[PDB]
Amino acid sequence: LKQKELIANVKNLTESDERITACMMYGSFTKGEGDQYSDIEFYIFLKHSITSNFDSSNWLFDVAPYLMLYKNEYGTEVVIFDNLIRGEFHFLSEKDMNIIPSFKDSGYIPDTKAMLIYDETGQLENYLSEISGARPNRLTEENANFLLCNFSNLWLMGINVLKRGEYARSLELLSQLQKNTLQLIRMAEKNADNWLNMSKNLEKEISLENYKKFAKTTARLDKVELFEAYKNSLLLVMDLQSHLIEQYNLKVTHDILERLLNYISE
């Protein structure tokens, strides 16, 4: 893979460059899930006193020639190499390495070995032992209640703008409630490790039954398809709620969802 060649380049450069103290890889190439369609992604930790004016534009071209480079909304350097492989590079001071422990709240990290690319002082290796084996429990009454409330809120807002005739806006809201729906399916089916990245591997991770029901909650920009998608997403959530009520105390009840159902006609 071209991306494994780029990874080896990153490993080579981060170890030899005096400006760089540590390098941590994340994403699919750290979990055995990388393929030809994958990106590459790293945190690059810099010597504190040169962090501000670090020439990332030049350094990244030293990794490989690129077509395009920009800083995204979260302050990550995002690159498209001339071979069309995407790379995400988060440049921070060595002193901000203390953000690493918070990564234990973000997902399943069974192994940490592929994450350590370079570690000058030993401190990256210690931070990673803090997150190794992390596995947040998503199957909580708090998640189920937040998701059902959020869904009801988004669904009602979406149906309102749809009734108004704001079709594009109801479509945008529909995509937000789809994300909510995936997390709920993952709760109902107890396959919730892919939590923030809820659509990742969906085709391999959920029952055909719920996958098809989810497919029915999608729509193109068209009034009839939108009304159909909204009704189906409420019907799906009604199914998910009757399952989740067996294991959690829910503030959103069938009678509340029933009020939303009757509203579509009004």
Known binding-site positions: 39, 41, 62, 88
- Positive or negative torsion for Cα 39, 43, 46, 48: positive
The residue among 27 and 136 lying less far from Mg ion, judged by its C-beta, is 27
Q: Under the criterion CB under 5 A, does residue 62 sit at the interface with Mg ion? A: yes
| Residue 157 touches which member of a copy of itself, Mg ion, none, C-beta under 5-8 Å by kind | a copy of itself
| Residues in binding site for Mg(2+) | 39, 41, 62, 88
What is the Cβ-side half-sphere exposure of residue 81, based on CA atoms within 13 angstroms?
Answer: 23
Instruction: Report the site for Mg ion in 88-117 (rule: CB under 5 A).
Output: 88
What is the C-alpha separation between 201 and 227, in angstroms, rounded? 28
Determine which residue in the list 4, 135, 254, 259 makes contact with a copy of itself, applying CB under 8 A: 259
CA separation for the pair 1, 240 (Å, rounded) = 41
**Nearest to 42, CA basis, from 32, 53, 30:** 30
**Residue 251 interacts with a copy of itself (CB under 8 A): yes or no:** yes
Binding to Mg ion in span 234-253, by CB under 5 A: none
Residues from 25 through 64 that contact a copy of itself (CB under 8 A): 35, 37-39
Is residue 240 involved in binding a copy of itself (CB under 8 A)?
no
Using DSSP bridges, classify how beta strands 40-46 and 86-93 pair: parallel, antiparallel or unpaired: parallel
Q: Considering beta carbons, is residue 10 or 148 the nearer one to a copy of itself?
A: 148
Min CB(179)–a copy of itself separation in Å: 7
Question: What is the full DSSP assignment across 51-82?
Answer: STT--HHHHHHHH--EEEEEE-TTS-EEEEET
Quick one: which of 179, 195, 232, 243 contacts a copy of itself (CB under 8 A)? 179
> β-pairing, 77-81 with 86-93?
antiparallel
Residues that bind Mg ion (CB under 5 A): 27-28, 39, 41, 62, 88
